[PDB]
Design goal:
Chain B: Its main location: nucleus. The structure is cut from a larger assembly and holds chains A (65 residues), B (46 residues), C (134 residues), D (266 residues) and E (114 residues). Chain B is built from no helices and 3 strands. Chain B is mostly beta strands and 46 residues long. Chain B has one domain: Rubrerythrin, domain 2 (Single Sheet). Chain B has a two-stranded antiparallel sheet with strand order 1-2. Chain C has 134 residues and is mainly beta. Chain C contains 1 helix and 9 strands. In chain C, strands 1-9-8-3 form a 4-stranded antiparallel beta sheet, with no helix packed on it. In chain C, strands 2-5-6 form a 3-stranded antiparallel beta sheet, with no helix packed on it. Chain D is α+β, with helices and mostly antiparallel strands and 266 residues long. Chain D folds into 2 domains: 1-40 and 167-266, 2-Layer Sandwich (Gyrase A, domain 2), CATH 3.30.1360; 41-166, DNA-directed RNA polymerase, insert domain (RNA Polymerase Alpha Subunit, Chain A, domain 2, Beta Complex). Helix content of chain D is 20%, strand content 26%. Chain D is built from 4 helices and 10 strands. Chain D starts with a strand and ends with a helix. Chain E has 114 residues and is of the alpha+beta class. Chain E has a single domain (1-114), classed as RNA polymerase, RBP11-like subunit (Gyrase A, domain 2). Chain E contains 2 helices and 4 strands; from the N terminus they run ββαββα. Chain E is flat. The N and C termini of chain E lie far apart (48 Å). The chains are: A mainly alpha (65), B mainly beta (46), C mainly beta (134), D alpha+beta (266), E alpha+beta (114). Chains in contact: A-C, A-D, B-C, B-D, C-D, D-E. Bound molecules: zinc ion (3 copies). The site of one zinc ion has 7 residues of chain D, from loops.
Chain lengths: 65, 46, 134, 266, 114
């Protein structure tokens, strides 16, 4: 269920850092924390936003109609 | 363009009379869904 | 936030914190007995019918169904079924008195017995309001 | 220049770190509030959905659209529709964007803030172009579509303050600290065995003179010199967040001054 | 459902003025200015500035209920000083303070490179 735009707590735009985050982990073979930081996600409210996100959209898309 | 129903199995545009029962013509399957109004809904992006 | 109360950042809420979708699926079927005797799904008028709801039926199409996408509120008749009397007395379903939403989807299928029966779902976004329990 | 003094340590496209010397707490704080709330910005405040065959709800999509940050540069030359004469909206009070996307590709199709399109005549104003800070040029990911799906919609972006909806925030976080040595004794540090060893000392400790251990407490001292860092979301550039911050605060004081003069007649 | 419109926070209603100046019933030379559609961004600022005026005896503000955007400012001045003036002077002082700040930040910003 798609990466929210902006962090609930602070408002820093997070809806653009997602795919970028996944490359850092997959392709760049980085760790979560360093990858989060590499995206400019300094505060813990911004950290959780991406870290604890579960992107169910991928699963929903999978449904045939 | 101007339909009444849609089959849920094969995502197919249809439209039939209550005098002509139910089910999909060129699929079989007995489901059916009403299809969006052309009425147009406006949302506050709030 | 005293005695098991809590304060929410209204700012966080607008940003999408704790927001949810609510879905209520209403349902009905044409008759339960009679070999020629059937109820009907259609938008009913004055037709010597009289005993009816209102909440306006006026959001129903000719099939006696709201089209997906209409906003529904109050006691808006969401399904227009009619009982024949030897005069079309009501039998139409209003949207749950307390509720209001947007018609999400309408399903028109048949039974094992071969009867017209409908399932009408309504979507509502529930935003973290005042005495909401967490 | 006469009163309050600014000393910018760091500055970027969307972040400014500075010091605010010769000011009262009330002023420093009130500036931080007005920067959070009271600054007007442009945001989608009406989505008209023609087609939506995505996995996402209409309102769920509308919600995200509102959050999408878009150019608020020439926002002072756009009217609050509330005070515009048109029946509903127009070109002097609104910006009209469009979104049409169809999953045509066998792979998953991504919808970006980059895919919105202005249809309103801007009259040469720097306004409502979805702000894109993303390296790859795509904006915020709005939605995703399978090979089948289509999403056809229209957006009306309008003038508004964060104080009405968080989407209107030119905001993001504002760092704010005064007296990193608790010389003021403006907080009583909780400890187990030692306040000094247990609490980690500030980045701003370098900018001040460490207490004096066996010296009297400054009872007469008044909190002044504020260490601040203002982060922009992107709609308005950082300099403008604080410049418009100062400005709008200055404005509401002036309306209260002008308010007095109206009661003065009768 | 029973919630008010979020513009009720900054938009004045039917009739409704910003300032309602009412004479203090208790102590003399004092007054109670009710600021309509306002918070701590304005309350505290005017209050703290008023406290710098070495002719203002009393100056405090309260926000009686959080549901409402509205605040009460109490002002008591020395004999021969109208509190309406003490406020006017305070307001004026703030605009000037902010003026310098804009000019200063602006100056410094131009000297900064990034
Ligand atoms: Zn954050
Ligand atoms: Zn079919
Ligand atoms: Zn207009």
């Amino acid at each position: 269920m798609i990466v929210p735009v902006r962090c609930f707590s602070c408002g820093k735009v997070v809806g653009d850092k997602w795919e970028s985050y996944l490359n850092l982990l997959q392709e760049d073979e980085l760790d979560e924390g360093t990858a989060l930081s590499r995206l400019g996600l300094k505060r813990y409210c911004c950290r959780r936003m991406i870290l604890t996100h579960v992107d169910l959209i991928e699963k929903f898309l999978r449904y045939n109609p | 363009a101007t339909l009444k129903y849609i089959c849920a199995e094969c995502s197919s545009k249809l439209s039939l009379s209550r005098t002509d029962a139910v089910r999909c013509k060129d699929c079989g399957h007995r489901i059916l869904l009403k299809a969006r109004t052309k009425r147009l809904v406006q949302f506050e992006a709030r | 936030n005293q005695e098991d109360s809590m304060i929410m950042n209204q700012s966080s809420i607008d940003r999408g914190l704790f927001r949810s979708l609510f879905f209520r699926s209403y349902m009905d079927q044409e008759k339960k007995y009679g070999m020629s005797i059937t109820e009907t799904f259609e938008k009913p008028q004055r037709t010597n019918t009289l005993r009816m709801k209102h909440g306006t039926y006026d959001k129903l199409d000719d099939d006696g169904l709201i089209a997906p996408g209409v906003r529904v509120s109050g006691e808006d008749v969401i399904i227009g079924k009619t009982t024949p009397i030897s005069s079309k007395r009501d039998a139409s379903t209003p949207l749950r008195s307390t509720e209001n939403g947007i018609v999400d989807q309408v399903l028109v299928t048949t039974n094992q017995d071969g009867l017209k029966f409908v399932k009408v779902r309504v979507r509502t976004t529930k935003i973290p309001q005042i005495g909401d329990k967490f | 220049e006469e009163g309050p003094q600014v000393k910018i340590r760091e500055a970027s496209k969307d972040n400014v770190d500075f010091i605010l010397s010769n000011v009262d707490l009330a002023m420093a704080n009130s500036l931080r509030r007005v920067m959070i709330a009271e600054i007007p910005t442009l945001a989608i405040d009406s989505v008209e959905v023609e087609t939506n065959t995505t996995v996402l709800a209409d309102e769920f999509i509308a919600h995200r659209l509102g959050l999408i940050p878009l150019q608020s540069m020439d926002i002072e030359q756009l009217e609050y529709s509330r005070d515009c004469f048109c029946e509903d909206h127009c070109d002097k009070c609104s910006v009209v964007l469009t979104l049409q996307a169809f999953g045509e590709s066998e792979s998953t199709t991504n919808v970006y803030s980059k895919d919105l399109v202005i249809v309103s005549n801007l009259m040469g104003r720097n306004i409502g172009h979805p702000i894109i800070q993303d390296k790859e040029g795509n904006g915020v990911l709005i939605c995703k579509l399978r090979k089948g799906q289509e999403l056809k919609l229209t957006c009306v972006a309008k003038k508004g303050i964060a104080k009405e909806h968080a989407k209107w925030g030119p905001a993001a976080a504002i760092e704010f600290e005064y007296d990193p040595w608790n010389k003021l004794k403006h907080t009583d540090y909780w400890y187990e065995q030692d306040s000094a060893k247990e609490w980690p000392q500030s980045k701003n400790c370098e900018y001040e003179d460490p207490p004096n251990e066996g010296d009297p407490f400054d009872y007469k001292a008044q909190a002044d010199t504020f260490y601040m860092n203002v982060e922009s979301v992107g709609s308005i550039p950082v300099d403008q967040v604080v410049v418009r911050g100062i400005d709008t605060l200055q404005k509401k004081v002036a309306s209260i001054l002008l308010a007095l003069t109206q009661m003065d007649q009768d | 459902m029973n919630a008010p419109d979020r513009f009720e926070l900054f938009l004045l209603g039917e009739g409704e003025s910003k300032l309602k100046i009412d004479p203090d019933t208790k102590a003399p030379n004092a007054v109670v200015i009710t600021f309509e559609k306002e918070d701590h961004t304005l309350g505290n600022l005017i209050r703290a500035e008023l406290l710098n005026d070495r002719k203002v005896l009393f100056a405090a503000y309260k926000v009686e209920h959080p549901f409402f955007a509205r605040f009460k400012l109490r002002i008591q001045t020395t004999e021969g000083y109208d509190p309406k003036d003490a406020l006017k002077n305070a307001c004026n002082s703030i605009i000037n303070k902010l003026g310098a700040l804009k000019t200063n930040f602006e100056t410094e910003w131009n000297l900064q490179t990034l």
